Design a binder for this molecule. Structure first.
Ligand SMILES: C[C@@H]1C[C@@H]([C@H](O)CC2CC(=O)NC(=O)C2)C(=O)[C@@H](C)C1
Lengths: 167, 185, 53, 148, 51, 122
RNA sequence: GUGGCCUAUCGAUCCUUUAGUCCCUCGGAAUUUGAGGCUAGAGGUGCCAGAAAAGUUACCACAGGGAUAACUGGCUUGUGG
RNA sequence: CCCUGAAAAUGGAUGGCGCUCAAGCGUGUUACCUAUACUCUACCGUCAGGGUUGAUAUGAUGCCCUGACGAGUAGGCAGGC
RNA sequence: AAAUAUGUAAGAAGUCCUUGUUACUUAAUUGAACGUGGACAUUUGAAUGAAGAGCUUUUAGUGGGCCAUUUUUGGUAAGCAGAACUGGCGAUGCGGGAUGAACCGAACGUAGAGUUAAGGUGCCGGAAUACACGCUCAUCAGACACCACAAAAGGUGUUAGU
RNA sequence: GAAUACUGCCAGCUGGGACUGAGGACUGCGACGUAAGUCAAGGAUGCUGGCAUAAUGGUUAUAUGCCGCCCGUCUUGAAACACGGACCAAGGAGUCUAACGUCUAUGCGAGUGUUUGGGUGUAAAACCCAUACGCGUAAUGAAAGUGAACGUAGGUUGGGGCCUCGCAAGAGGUGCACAAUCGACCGAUCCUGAUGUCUUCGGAUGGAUUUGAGUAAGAGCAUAGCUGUUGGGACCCGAAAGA
């Protein structure tokens, strides 16, 4: 033998975990974050876009739709920590939004082989977008310059201090 | 920083095991470790500690000493316990019937005890018969009768034996030992 | 003091058990009322320096 | 064996355990018993009082065989009888058939009296005997026969 | 396995000291004191105002 | 003990603690000396097991014996392991610690301000 | 009253000598000389816990020492300026 | 407080740059910076105190629980390569 | 005749009652010493602490020291020589005094977070070109303890005061 | 008649930030609950995304910020304008022995040690053994000599363990080792000096501020080991000399 043997062998049985005392209580959003508030998107492919907050989802995400008619942002989820809640608000008591949940935004069952190693929007998404944002457009047109504001992108200017800004 | 009031990392200074490699002594230590943990009898703890001692700390116990111990009032029927060797003594001519538990019996001591109608038994037999040391009597031999102890604490006026090879006249009985030759101690 | 301790114990056996035989250090003082009646406070001040010669 | 010595542990340490200041030297205080009266006086007087000087008379041509006289005490006296017959002698202590113990053949010159033999008569044959040893033998009922 | 601070972690704070719930229910940390209209003596006032 | 305090004055800051200070100190940093070991109190049963023979059945009983210096103060205080405080959270308030509190330093009797110091240190 | 009113006024081993015990030993017996022992003093070591001890080296040697002198430097500044 | 008293040898030292309602001197009040120190946590080792054998564990100088400690020449001891 | 420093005591190996031993002692059945019996938990005779207490054997290195505050001797003095107590360096890194054995702070397993010590916060350089009241202008300003020096003596410079 | 400052208290509420997630069935203390149960209550879980490889990470070179004087040595103090060291390889210094101390392990144990020698052998091995001898079991004295129980091998104080009673402290009894103490015994020293008698021998009995490396129900012998000691070349290298 090149090595004698371990006289002691460690046990091969994996211990079970102890009971964890951590229940999952619901998130407590900020006070400024209420449905209908215009949000500034701080990250993603829609950085700086003005969107309307619509619904708090069960995965803690926020359902936004800055209508295509204004800025091209579709119905999608965002994280509450990556938006700025402004002071301008539109009425959201005329839109139906309970049908939108995590299953509505389920993406794909990615496997170990179905990958784009080298290099189509659904019709229900298109129609749900039109139905949700027609009433948003009707609310948006009810105040001057709201459509233009929501179409424009946010960006910091020179000598613009965000710790002293009011949104 | 901490203002230490005592030496740090100080070992207790007591044997926690026999230094010997005797497997049978180690089995006895295993038995009395279990007994001293699982019983509240101080006898088992005493025996466990006695099983750690060195040869000079387990002096032999003579059968005369055993008989003198059994002479004490109410001690006639007690089991004598010697954690060490029991040796024979020809100075004494009569023995009572008694039970002696010991690590070792000399051939003469074993013969004399058995001839007196008694029985010699090992410490595990003692553990089986008396698990809490019921009705026992622990005997210990004389420690300071060792010849090395004669020389401990040698010094002027201390009255100890000098470390010396040859003995007699001409060997350290002169100046320093009598007033006619300088001084006495 | 040994004789006094024995006598205190002997009396405490009759009445007043726990007769507090041990001595104690001087305790901090208890509360008290200090009366100004006939004892109006006199105000003192530091004194100026003088040469004395 | 060399592998258990401190020499192996001192490998790598400069002074080999002898100190940097003291510097283990050849014979810093002399050889043997040098200076026993001068610079080793305190050691010699504390641990070996009596060392210096002479006491007593000389003895030219001393033969230790003249002084051969091993001592045997009464408490060990009965060990000279073999075990197979000691018991029959201790029982039936008779003035008419008493054991003869020849201590000289046993290799002893004088019988001392540390005493407490059993009350059994014995004929003790010896070159020399102490007063108390003879008294205890006779009180036990035996006799001491002197031999050369 | 972990020392949990009372004065926070109300659960340990109430495991020790069961009276803490009564304290916080009766608001014993904000006990309104009675009104007394005792006036210091004039001699006290002049002594304080002296010099 | 006052002569001891005089004798160690340049090395300590001391004063008269308030009930709030004692309660927070024993709730936050209270440890028992059980069998020569530093044991976090963390439960009333520990105090009952080691101090119940003096009638102290809880951490509030222990605090009461501290605040009103009771008949068994010596045993309760000795049961308490010496408190290991941190450095004060807003600092010492002085440029140099090793002058008397009276002379603008930190050591000595600062009697009632010991509460503020200990709260910052706790 | 167990020397000097108190605090200083003094000395091992070996050797010699004296007193004491009339004692022990001279070993094949014995006696008498002689010698050696045991107890207690003295004869002395002042480098005073105690070797028996003259110089010189500019012909020199060795082990070492910056534990230590003979320059500079450093501290100091009496003296000097 | 400032100035005179106030002279040494390579060019030179509030540490340097520089500083004048100071970035100087005296004094007060705060905020702030950062040690291998203090507090809390993890991990290593050491020491101490403990638990663990009537079908339950490599069958015990093993496993495990709890607390506290840790600077080091000369040197001592121990476990290892 | 201090201050500081220093001896002892603060009990069970104790206290009390009674009566036992002796060849000592007493005029004495007086004592002395040691005892037999009997009575003494809220505190068994002040505080605080106690890290286990007590005991033994054996052996290493060392037996050049030096520095600081305070006391102190010789010397004009010395980074001189010699003592006292304590703390240090030697044997010790770390933050600060630019630098430095000894000063200040703090003593050290490997890391993370927080807070500080001494020292600092114009820039070098982490941190207020903070706030407040005054003083000073130097044709050698001054700028932090140990510490890297300054005096006697002078100025209708300027500022407070008797 | 009020406010407010300052100081202090709350087992008042609440927002932002950072570091940490040790453990691994259950057991505990609690809280909310009418209960079932739930919980922030003896240490992190839940949900989601990208990548699945040099992407993270390791190693290495370099750059940057800050720090970092050359080791060994003697020394109070070394980076020193103190000494040794240009570089590399190989060699290079506490050993063995005789006799010992303490400690430890082992065998046997009032004994212990076979190995001088003899017997035997598978032949420097292993195995077996008589008589002696060494140490120990007796000390003390210069020596001639003498030579260790008044007693339950003593009394007293303490003493682990054990025994008896005891819900439980505790109280009694016995108490080995060990410690202190007062005694007893053996030898030396000094003293006392009976019966008896080769009339100078013998030395009973009793005593003591004396003395011993003693007795008082043995502890030793042998082997081995670390450390320490002495003699030896003696940790290694080194004189000027002497014969
Ligand atoms: C001066 C004279 C002699 C002196 C002594 O014997 C000298 C030496 C002689 C010797 O070789 N070795 C020693 O031990 C001592 C002594 O006793 C004095 C009283 C009398």
């Amino acid at each position: 033998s090149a090595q004698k043997a371990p006289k002691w062998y460690p046990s091969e049985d994996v211990a079970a975990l102890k009971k964890t005392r951590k229940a999952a209580r619901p998130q407590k959003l900020r006070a400024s974050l209420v449905p209908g508030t215009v949000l500034i998107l701080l990250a993603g492919r829609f950085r700086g876009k003005r969107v309307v907050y619509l619904k708090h989802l069960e995965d803690n995400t926020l359902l936004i739709s800055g209508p295509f008619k204004v800025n091209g942002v579709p119905l999608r989820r965002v994280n509450a920590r990556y938006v700025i809640a402004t002071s301008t608000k539109v009425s959201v008591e005329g839109v139906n939004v309970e049908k939108f949940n995590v299953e509505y935004f389920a993406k794909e069952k990615l496997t170990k082989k179905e990958k784009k190693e080298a290099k189509e929007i659904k019709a229900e998404r298109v129609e749900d977008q039109k139905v949700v944002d027609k009433a948003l457009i009707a609310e948006i047109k009810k105040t001057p310059l709201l459509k233009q504001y929501l179409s424009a992108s946010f960006s910091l200017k020179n000598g613009d201090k965000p710790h002293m800004l009011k949104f | 920083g901490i203002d230490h009031t005592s030496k740090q990392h100080k070992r207790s200074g007591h044997r926690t095991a026999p230094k010997s490699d005797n497997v049978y002594l180690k089995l006895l230590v295993k038995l009395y470790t279990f007994l001293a943990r699982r019983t509240d009898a101080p006898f088992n703890k005493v025996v466990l500690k006695a099983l750690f001692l060195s040869k000079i700390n387990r002096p032999p116990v003579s059968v005369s000493r055993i008989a003198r111990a059994l002479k004490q009032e109410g001690a006639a029927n007690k089991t004598v316990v010697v954690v060490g060797t029991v040796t024979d003594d020809a100075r004494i001519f009569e023995f009572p019937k008694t039970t002696v538990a010991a690590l070792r019996f000399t051939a003469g001591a074993r013969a004399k005890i058995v001839k007196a109608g008694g029985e010699c038994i090992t410490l595990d037999q003692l553990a089986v018969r008396a698990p809490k040391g019921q009705n026992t009597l622990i005997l210990r031999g004389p420690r300071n009768s060792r010849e090395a102890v004669r020389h401990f604490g040698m010094g002027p006026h201390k009255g100890k034996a000098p470390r010396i090879l040859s003995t007699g006249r001409k060997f350290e009985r002169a100046r320093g030992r009598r007033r006619s030759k300088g001084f006495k101690v | 003091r040994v004789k006094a301790n024995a006598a205190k114990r002997a009396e405490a056996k009759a009445q007043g058990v726990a007769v507090q035989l041990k001595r104690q250090p001087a305790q901090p003082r208890e509360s008290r009322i200090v009366s100004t009646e006939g004892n109006v406070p006199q105000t003192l001040a530091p004194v100026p320096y003088e040469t004395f010669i | 064996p060399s592998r258990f010595t401190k020499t192996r542990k001192h490998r790598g340490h400069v002074s080999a355990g002898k100190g940097r200041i003291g510097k283990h030297r050849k014979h810093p205080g002399g050889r043997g018993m040098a200076g026993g009266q001068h610079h080793h006086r305190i050691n010699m007087d504390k641990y070996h009082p009596g060392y210096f000087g002479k006491v007593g008379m000389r003895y030219f041509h001393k033969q230790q065989a003249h002084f051969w006289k091993p001592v045997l005490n009464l408490d060990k006296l009965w060990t000279l009888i073999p075990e197979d017959k000691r018991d029959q002698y201790l029982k039936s202590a008779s003035k008419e058939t008493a054991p003869v113990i020849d201590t000289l053949a046993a290799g002893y010159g004088k019988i001392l009296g540390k005493g407490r033999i059993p009350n059994v008569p014995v004929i003790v044959k010896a070159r020399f005997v102490s007063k108390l040893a003879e008294e205890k033998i006779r009180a036990a009922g035996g006799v001491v026969e002197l031999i050369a | 396995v972990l020392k949990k601070n009372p004065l926070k972690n109300k659960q340990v704070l109430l495991r020790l000291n069961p009276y803490a719930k009564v304290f916080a229910a009766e608001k014993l940390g904000s006990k309104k004191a009675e009104k007394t209209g005792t006036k210091p003596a004039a001699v006290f006032t002049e002594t304080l105002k002296h010099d | 003990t006052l002569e001891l305090l005089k004798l160690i004055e340049p090395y300590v800051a001391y004063g008269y603690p308030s009930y709030s200070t004692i309660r927070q100190l024993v709730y936050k940093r209270g440890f028992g000396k059980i069998n020569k070991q530093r044991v976090p109190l963390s439960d009333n049963a520990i105090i009952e097991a080691n101090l119940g023979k003096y009638g102290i059945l809880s951490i509030d009983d222990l605090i009461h014996e501290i605040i009103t210096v009771g008949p068994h103060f010596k045993q309760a205080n000795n049961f308490l392991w010496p408190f290991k405080l941190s450095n004060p959270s807003g600092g010492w308030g002085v440029p140099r610690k090793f002058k008397h509190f009276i002379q603008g330093g930190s050591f000595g009797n600062r009697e009632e301000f010991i509460n503020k110091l200990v709260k910052s240190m706790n």
